[PDB]
Amino acid sequence: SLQRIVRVSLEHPTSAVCVAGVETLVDIYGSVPEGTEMFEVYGTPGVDIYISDTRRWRFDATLEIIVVMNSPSNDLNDSHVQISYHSSHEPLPLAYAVLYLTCVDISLDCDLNCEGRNFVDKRQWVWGPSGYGGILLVNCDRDDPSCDVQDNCDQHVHCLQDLEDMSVMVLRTQGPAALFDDHKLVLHTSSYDAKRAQVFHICGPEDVCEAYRHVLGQDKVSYEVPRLHGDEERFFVEGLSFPDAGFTGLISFHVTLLDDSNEDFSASPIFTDTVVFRVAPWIMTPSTLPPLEVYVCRVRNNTCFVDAVAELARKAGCKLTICPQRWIQDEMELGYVQAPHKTLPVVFDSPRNGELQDFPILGPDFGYVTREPRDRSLDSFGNLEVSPPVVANGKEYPLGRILIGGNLPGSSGRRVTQVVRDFLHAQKVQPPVELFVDWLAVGHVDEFLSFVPAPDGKGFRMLLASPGACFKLFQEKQKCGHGRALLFQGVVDDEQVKTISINQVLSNKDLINYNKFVQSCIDWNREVLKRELGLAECDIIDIPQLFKTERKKATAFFPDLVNMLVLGKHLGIPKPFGPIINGCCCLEEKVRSLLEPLGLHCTFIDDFTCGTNVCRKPFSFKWWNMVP
Amino acid sequence: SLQRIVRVSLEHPTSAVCVAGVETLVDIYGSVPEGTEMFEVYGTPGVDIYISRFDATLEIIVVMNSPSNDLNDSHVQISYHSSHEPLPLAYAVLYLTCVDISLDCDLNCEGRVDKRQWVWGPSGYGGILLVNCDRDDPSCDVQDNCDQHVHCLQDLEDMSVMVLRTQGPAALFDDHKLVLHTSSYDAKRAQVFHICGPEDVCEAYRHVLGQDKVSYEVPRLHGDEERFFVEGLSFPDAGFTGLISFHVTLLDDSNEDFSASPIFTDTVVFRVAPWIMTPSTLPPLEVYVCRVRNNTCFVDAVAELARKAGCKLTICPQAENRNDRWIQDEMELGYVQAPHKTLPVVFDSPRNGELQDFPYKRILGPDFGYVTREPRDRLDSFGNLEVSPPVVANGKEYPLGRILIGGNLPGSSGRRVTQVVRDFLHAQKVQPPVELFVDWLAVGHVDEFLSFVPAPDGKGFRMLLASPGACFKLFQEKQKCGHGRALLFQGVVDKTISINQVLSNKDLINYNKFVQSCIDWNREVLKRELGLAECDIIDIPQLFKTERKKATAFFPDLVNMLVLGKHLGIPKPFGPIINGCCCLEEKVRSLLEPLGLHCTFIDDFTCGTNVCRKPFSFKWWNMVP
Ligand SMILES: [Ca+2]
Ligand SMILES: [Ca+2]
Ligand SMILES: [Ca+2]
Ligand SMILES: [Ca+2]
Ligand SMILES: [Ca+2]
Ligand SMILES: [Ca+2]
Ligand SMILES: [Ca+2]
Ligand SMILES: [Ca+2]
Ligand SMILES: [Ca+2]
Ligand SMILES: [Ca+2]
Ligand SMILES: [Cl-]
Ligand SMILES: [Cl-]
């Protein structure tokens, strides 16, 4: 309703400004003429008058007059309302009161992203399919081909491609120009919001980068808008901060009309319109999403690994980037930000000191984000993974759920710094899950947990390392007369690492009992994952994997099978140098019998003789349609 | 829901611990004996066994409901048989020790249960924690929550109780550790003392969780129940939603060669009670005034009004850092409330110095807490801060009222309320603030044009708005009756003006029309955000003049009154004297006395007044924000 009160006087005609579609209540300042018993209200064409007027003579009471104008005025004071006060004793009216009106239309709008929900409250941002609201990206992608830092570090536009990342804000003002000579039009935002976004007002041709004037920014919280382009001014909004521990992700911009007609008095508010943007969060891509680019580091002695990765990537049809030497898999994670107008892959760099090949990856349409710890004296993103879309606890996680290696209550050190946990939780669209990894020497999630695509059941199957599975496999192979088959029969007379037989493995009671303890450690996480991801036993696959002891913690006995490179249907699995039976590794044949029915192709790669990371396509599901 | 997996082996008997009422799934580590199989499961008394017998991918589930008396005093035996021979193929044994572990608090349940959540509303639940900011110790000079010790037994009356109940064989806890822990973030905002000796000894309450203590191995000294006392350190703020969690975790440390493993975890979630403002319609308990030299008459009138009411009166001394009206502008009086204790709490305006709010017991003393903030930049006057009675608006209900904050006009250079204060007030979440337009005033305090009084009719209150139009009407009507020669400021013993001269000053009348429009903007904002109608509002006649092109009171501000129940102390308007009475006083009387209120007009020009009030009967945890 946004109702408004305007007072008229008997001795002077008053002049006021109203906004189209806004109810204006006409009251009196001072007494009515002595003797008033009835009143009449008349208005010029275009002025709708209500009484809480066709019937002119109206009895006097504590009743309100409401005037409405629906179309903006062409000239100042081109319309008016006249109240006539009469007495029942005399035919001549007691007095006249005049309210001249100027009607204006003011609207601050953005792309509310409306295809399933209209004319709703522009001051809110609603999640879900029936939601709406502008979306703002963090301009963290360095589009300028002659700049060394991110595009949102300065207060200027230095390339026209940069505008593709920004969001558009349109200010429509319909009215007589002379009015805006003494009625100021102020675009403003809060200081808090000012430190997290910037606004450029376009003032010349679009071709000119210098025409995009920095209007709202780090210290600019208000700006008087000159109406240079007639009835529409254009602003470009540029995000500066992802959602964080203290930043819910909402940023507001307002336009306020201020009456400054009288230089002796003070300014006064007349109308205010608001737009609310939500900063798009950083979203992780699980291994079930289609790949676009694989990253590898060719060092000395790893040529075979890089070659096998290149062969797998060409068999999958995705790009491959050989990186010079930091760490491809542990010092960075690859996600994306998504807005209706542009999607940007974004690298989350592990907190360190230096620009180390991730900042110098950071190029056009490829953004960068990182954090700085509180105690600058680290984080390994091998403790960080994400699940495919799931449904659990009656809730739906269509972008999956983040999986973070946790710390055991009472442990001395922390495995993930507080800044990273706060960032991941603040993204709000992939609610994290704590896992139990302190039993591992390193503690990375991919040492016991992975996901692969499948056509049956849900879109995926969860691979869990299982000492019990390998125990069963070796027992069955021994019962079949293959107990003398040797593990690690890779290279003889040219590489000196002793071999071991199935009999020797099954006879080592310490090894079997320790792997039973490891199996229980993995069973804890198995139950936690079944609960937090809504999984059943048919969703899980126990991949045979044995562990040994290092510093009283768990390490892989043979290469980690669960830690594979997933590229669509193509799997690059670390080659297990297991028992050779009939000319084949029984571990390879077991993994094949487990995975190939799912339509996946298994290529076993020697990573024993690294670093691999994948940029993937975003979810088809739009994050703004999720209900957190 | 909290299912657990335990694996048995054919060659070694396994031993495990289970928690009462928690399903433990029994699986096999390794192969079953070679050949066609069937299995039988039997369990000792106290062991409930279910099956979800032919062999398939089917699960065995074991449950124990009562804790064990001895280690491994119960067991489950799986027997593998073949259909070809009567003799069983093999046996697998799982010895079990059942334990009951529970970390609990007073969940505040009389109208309603997941212990890991905190739910608002009448159908809600959850523990409540106060901020121990009240200085109960008569020999400490600072707040009670500054150290890591308990120095007086009355301090425990502010804390919340956390009970850890563990039923099981003692020998188990020789190799199964019991760890009470909380997050670092939560650790910096609460403290936990574990009681270890007699309650009489303050030194027996040992600091176990605090600023840097995030975990603690608890020794079971008192049998099956240990008690902890939780003490809040921080109100909700911009980055603190107000929730604090504590967990107990059982850790298997049986094998020194392996690493520890989790077994069970229970959680308690506390909500820190917010700071709540008290509107003028609430019953008073204590009035505060500052007696200086030459202002004795004002203090006397306030004392007489407080004696006419049933509340206490405190004469406050003035320190070196002196704002003129420091009783009302440098401090606000609210409260925090938990089912076990209610504390009045003074919000001290952010400044430099300890000035009678921090030192002296009538404000910061036993069962009277203190809270303040420090600005980030280089300002705050709590005259820009008020609060409304309980209201209903926008389809929502505000049973603790809504805070009203004087706002800044878009484009203004300075801010009248710093960001820390706005963040604090918004974080309290139970009195959602409303921004007002006050930049038209020279000072800009809310009480320059707005007030509330109790009423028996309607919503229980009336909103008083200063109105130049009302005074205009009053003076015009008095002039029509032949009283235009009546003089304002006649009863003055220190410059008189007549009704005719006031009505003849066209600049003054136009300026007061502009002021009336400025107040009308706020009137519409308040009608919208508080669900008010015209019958809820009263236009108190008030004229304004210009100072530095801003609005100041022409005669004393009538709206800025002291409300004590039915008794009103209104600033005396030295208006036109007619028939021996001030027509402004008679007008205010005709407006207010029908509401059952008593009007005493007090000369405060010839100050500072503040009121501590009774808390709302409505409990804040029953509100749904
Ligand atoms: Ca730029
Ligand atoms: Ca850019
Ligand atoms: Ca850095
Ligand atoms: Ca771009
Ligand atoms: Ca990772
Ligand atoms: Ca203490
Ligand atoms: Ca205390
Ligand atoms: Ca201070
Ligand atoms: Ca106390
Ligand atoms: Ca106040
Ligand atoms: Cl790409
Ligand atoms: Cl008291």
Query: Structural class, judged by helices and strands of chain A?
Result: mainly beta
Chain pair forming the biggest interface = A-B, 66 and 67 residues
Q: What share of the residues of chain A lie within helices?
A: 10-25%
Describe the oligomeric state of these chains in a short phrase: homodimer
Tell me the Rg of chain A in angstroms.
35 Å
The small-molecule ligands in this entry are:
calcium ion, chloride ion
Tell me the total number of β-strands of chain A: 42
First and last CA, distance of chain A = 31 Å
Biggest beta-sheet profile of chain A: 9 strands, mixed
General shape of chain A: elongated
Strand content of chain A: 25-35%
Tally of contiguous helical segments of chain A = 8
Count structural domains of chain A: 3
Family (chain A): Belongs to the protein arginine deiminase family.
EC number (chain A): 3.5.3.15
Keywords (chain A): Calcium, Cytoplasm, Disease variant, Hydrolase
Protein name (chain A): Protein-arginine deiminase type-3
